[PDB]
Amino acid sequence: AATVAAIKEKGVIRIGVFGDKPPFGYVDANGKNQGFDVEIAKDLAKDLLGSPDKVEFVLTEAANRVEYVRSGKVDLILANFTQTPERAEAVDFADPYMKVALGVVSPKNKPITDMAQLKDQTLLVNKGTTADAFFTKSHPEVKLLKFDQNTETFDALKDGRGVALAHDNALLWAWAKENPNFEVAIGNLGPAEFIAPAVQKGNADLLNWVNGEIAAMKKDGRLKAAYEKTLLPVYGEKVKPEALLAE
Ligand SMILES: [Zn+2]
Ligand SMILES: [Zn+2]
Ligand SMILES: [Zn+2]
Ligand SMILES: [Zn+2]
Ligand SMILES: [Zn+2]
Ligand SMILES: [Zn+2]
């Protein structure tokens, strides 16, 4: 409906998540959904439905997040979704659970640190992300090559299809850790934005329930537990939990 009652009746919550954005949302070698956003999703299903296994996870491209929640394909988006005023015209955001800024990653042998360095060159972005929207709006002089999926986008960077790739910095730090010929040579392109769950526009019933759940997870340690399970192993002491988690 996708109201609380309607979802209880179906016995399963459909949740939009990433398949290829570790450590936020991905699929492990056993074909199981994992990551920070997924842990939050399992917590919500346990409270709503009585069991964390009552989520149907639906793999969502960045560009499809709005459409999937709008059309009813999912009940809720937890595909690491940055809240923006433009997006908020199309969907309703619950209370934020994390924050993130954009960054730019490039090979260590040709680091990119400023926009003039993109002259006559290509920047890679995952289509429909805040990095895509940022460069399109604020740097129209920069030539973009866009791919639907994260794996394609980072593969194109490995293949030299562009000189750099822009995305959430936390993603770029996690990726560069396992790809050490790259560095995040621009760590921050401006103030951090919140990441938040999203429901269909007008769905105040599910929105209100999601808000209470997020708030409760902040207070009772469930959000901190999710960060310790999925994020802390990646960043260690290099990124303080108060830099990632939303108050
Ligand atoms: Zn019915
Ligand atoms: Zn510019
Ligand atoms: Zn696609
Ligand atoms: Zn493709
Ligand atoms: Zn390749
Ligand atoms: Zn490793």
Is residue 167 annotated as involved in ligand binding? no
Distance 71 CA to ligand 1 centre (A): 19
User: Do 125 and 237 lie in a common domain?
Assistant: no
Question: Resolution of this entry in Å?
Answer: 2.3
Is residue 155 annotated as involved in ligand binding? yes
User: How far are the Cα atoms of 2, 54, 83, 212 from residue 206, in angstroms, in the given order?
Assistant: 7, 16, 17, 10
Distance 155 CA to ligand 5 centre (A): 5
User: Do 163 and 118 lie in a common domain?
Assistant: yes
User: Do 73 and 106 lie in a common domain?
Assistant: no
- What whole-number distance in Å separates Cα of residue 132 and Cα of residue 145? 9
Query: Which residues sit with Cβ closer than 5 angstroms to ligand 3, an ion?
Result: 148
Distance 23 CA to ligand 5 centre (A): 22
Distance 127 CA to ligand 3 centre (A): 9
Please name which ligand lies nearest the alpha carbon of 143: 2
- Say which CATH number the domain at 160 has: 3.40.190.10
B/e letters for 39-53, b = 16+ CB within 10 Å, e = fewer, are bbbbbbbeebbeeee
User: Do 86 and 181 lie in a common domain?
Assistant: no
Query: Which residues sit with Cβ closer than 5 angstroms to ligand 5, an ion?
Result: 155, 159
User: Do 55 and 23 lie in a common domain?
Assistant: yes
The tally of domains found in the chain comes to 2
User: Do 27 and 123 lie in a common domain?
Assistant: no
Bond into 176 cis (ω within 30): no
- What whole-number distance in Å separates Cα of residue 233 and Cα of residue 199? 30
- What whole-number distance in Å separates Cα of residue 134 and Cα of residue 155? 22
Distance 148 CA to ligand 3 centre (A): 5
Q: How far, in whole angstroms, is CA 29 from its chain's centroid?
A: 21
Would you give the DSSP letter of residue 191?
Answer: S
Give the domain extent around 114. 102-192
User: Do 19 and 137 lie in a common domain?
Assistant: no
User: Do 14 and 71 lie in a common domain?
Assistant: yes
The helix (H) or strand (E) run that includes residue 186 is strand 182-186
User: Do 224 and 110 lie in a common domain?
Assistant: no
Is residue 56 annotated as involved in ligand binding? no
- What whole-number distance in Å separates Cα of residue 216 and Cα of residue 8? 20
Between strands 13-17 and 55-59, the pairing is parallel
User: Do 132 and 143 lie in a common domain?
Assistant: yes
Computed on alpha carbons and rounded to an integer, the radius of gyration of the chain in Å comes to 18
Please name which ligand lies nearest the alpha carbon of 152: 4
User: Do 108 and 4 lie in a common domain?
Assistant: no
Find where tokens 């988690």 sit.
Answer: 245
